[PDB]
Design an enzyme around this catalytic site. Structure first.
Site, PDB file in Angstrom:
ATOM      1  N   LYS A  39      10.094  -7.569  22.647  1.00  0.00           N
ATOM      2  CA  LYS A  39       9.833  -7.342  21.304  1.00  0.00           C
ATOM      3  C   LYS A  39      10.126  -8.509  20.670  1.00  0.00           C
ATOM      4  CE  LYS A  39      13.272  -4.981  18.250  1.00  0.00           C
ATOM      5  NZ  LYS A  39      13.005  -5.392  16.702  1.00  0.00           N
ATOM      6  N   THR A  60      17.856   0.508  10.231  1.00  0.00           N
ATOM      7  CA  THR A  60      18.569   0.741   8.975  1.00  0.00           C
ATOM      8  C   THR A  60      18.515   2.034   8.562  1.00  0.00           C
ATOM      9  OG1 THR A  60      18.197  -1.523   8.487  1.00  0.00           O
ATOM     10  CG2 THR A  60      19.202  -0.282   6.832  1.00  0.00           C
TER      11      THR A  60
END
Ligand code: CA
Ligand code: CA
Ligand code: CA
Ligand code: CA
Ligand code: CA
Ligand code: CA
Lengths: 242, 242
Positions: free
Chosen positions: A99, A207
Site C-alpha cells: 500500500k 479515522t
C-alpha cells in the site's frame, strides 16, 4: 467474486481497514471481523525500524489464511523514506504487496513522488496500490507502470468530509482499467455507499472507525453500505443520480 | 428491528416505505415490496370499484398482505377539500384510520398551510396522520401539536432523483420534533437513503428511484440494505465533519 487478484491472493471484501495505528490485538481482531475484512496491513517506520502489528501477532485470534498480508509506507514524507520502508517490509517480513504512500506537508499524497517511487518498486517487482489525488495523467501513468489498483483521495485524511469531487472520481474510474479504491476523509456509511455508486471497487477506512462512539457498529455499518452501494450501482439508477 | 412507529397494535419496522399507489402492475408491486423488505401497504382499494378490487385480489395471492400495515392515501386528490373527502370515505368504506396525507400545489409540492388545516380537521375526528411537508419548523411543530403520528419531509422535488437538497435543515427539524421523520421526495439511489438515516430519519419513502432503475428489484434490495447501514451508522455515532 474477487474485485482484485494478485498472484494467488484474492481481494473480496469491499472494506479495507487501516489498522497500522492499532496496538491492541483484540481490537484489531474485532474491527477486522466487524468490517468483514480480508486484508491485513503492516507498516514500518524506516528511521527506527519499529513495526505495527504483524499478521502473525493475530495467529491465536484470526484465521490467518483468510487474510492477505500487505505492507504500507505510512511514515514516508519523501520518495526515499517510502523505498526504504518498502524494502524493509520485503526483506524482513517477505511482503510482496504494498500500500504505497508518499505524503506532502499537509498529509496529502504527493502525486509526482508517488509515481517515481512506484516506478522504482515495480522495477523490483513489488505489487503496488498507490494513493493519489484524483488526477487522470497520474492514474494512467500508474496503471502503465503495472500497479494492481489505485487508491484515490476522496477528501483530506481525518476530515470525515466524504467525497469532495465525485465527478472527478467517476471520470477516473471510467477511464482506468484497474480497480479503484476510494480512500481519505471517509466519515460514515453513506460515504461508502456513495463511493460504490461511482464505480469504486472498494473503500479504505481508518479515522471513521477510531473516532466513532461505537467502532464495531460503524465497521458493520460500512460493510453493509458497501454491499448497498454495489447493488445500487448494479441496478442502474435513474440517470439524474449520475 | 425495533419499531420506529406504533399506532394502536400496528408496528412499523421496515425503514423503507414504497409509494406504490400509482403502480398498476401486480408483479412490480409484489417484487418491489418483497425486495424492499417493506411492511406498509399503501392502498387505494375501493371495495365496489371493479378495477381496484381485481388488482387487490390479484396481488393478495402473491404477497402476504396480512403481514403489512394498511394505510390510505390522499395523494390522488388535488385540493384540500378533496383530500378531506378521500380520508373520510377511506375510513367509512374500509375502516382504515391511518392516512398518508398529501395536500399539494399544482407544482406537485406540499402546501404546508393547507396540509396543517387538513391535519387539524382530520385529527379532530381521530384519524392517525402522516402528512408531507416542505422542511419548515413552524409547520412541523404545529403538526406535532395536532398529534400527527409521523412527519414526511421533502428532500428534493418529486421524481427528480436529486437526493437531499438541504440536509442541515432536515437534521435541525428532526432534532426539534418529537415525532418520527420520514424523508421523502427526489430520492434517487441507495446513497440518499443512507444519508437520510444519518440525519436521524426513522425511514425513507421511495417511489421514482425504483420505477426508473434498470432493475427495480436490485434497487429496492439495495435501499433496504442502505437504510439498515445508515441506521447502524447513525447509532454508532459518526465522527463530526471537519
Ligand atoms: Ca497507535
Ligand atoms: Ca504502535
Ligand atoms: Ca474502471
Ligand atoms: Ca367506490
Ligand atoms: Ca395473482
Ligand atoms: Ca413523541
Amino acid at each position: 467474486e474477487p474485485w482484485l487478484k494478485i498472484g494467488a491472493r484474492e481481494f473480496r471484501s469491499r472494506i479495507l481497514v487501516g489498522i497500522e495505528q492499532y496496538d491492541s490485538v483484540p481490537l484489531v481482531r474485532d474491527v477486522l471481523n466487524a468490517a468483514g475484512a480480508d486484508v491485513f496491513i503492516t507498516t514500518v517506520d524506516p528511521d527506527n525500524r519499529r513495526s505495527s502489528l504483524l499478521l502473525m501477532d493475530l495467529a491465536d485470534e484470526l484465521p490467518l489464511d483468510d487474510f492477505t498480508w500487505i505492507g504500507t509506507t505510512s511514515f514516508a514524507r519523501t520518495k526515499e523514506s517510502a523505498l526504504r520502508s518498502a524494502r524493509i517490509l520485503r526483506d524482513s517480513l517477505g511482503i510482496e504487496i504494498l500500500k504505497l504512500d508518499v505524503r506532502g506537508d499537509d498529509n496529502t499524497p504527493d502525486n509526482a513522488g508517488t509515481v517515481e517511487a512506484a516506478r522504482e518498486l515495480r522495477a523490483e517487482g513489488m505489487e503496488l496500490l498507490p494513493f493519489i489525488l484524483p488526477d487522470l495523467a497520474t492514474a494512467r501513468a500508474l496503471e502503465e507502470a503495472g500497479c494492481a489498483a489505485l487508491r484515490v483521495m476522496a477528501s483530506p485524511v481525518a476530515s470525515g468530509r466524504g467525497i469532495a469531487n465525485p465527478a472527478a472520481i467517476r471520470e477516473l474510474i471510467e477511464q482506468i482499467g484497474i480497480p479503484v479504491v476510494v480512500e481519505g476523509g471517509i466519515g460514515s456509511a453513506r460515504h461508502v455507499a456513495e463511493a460504490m455508486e461511482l464505480g469504486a471497487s472498494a473503500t479504505l477506512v481508518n479515522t471513521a472507525l477510531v473516532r466513532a462512539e461505537s467502532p464495531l457498529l460503524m465497521a458493520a455499518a460500512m460493510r453493509q453500505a458497501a454491499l448497498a452501494g454495489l447493488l445500487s450501482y448494479e441496478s442502474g439508477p435513474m440517470p439524474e443520480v449520475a
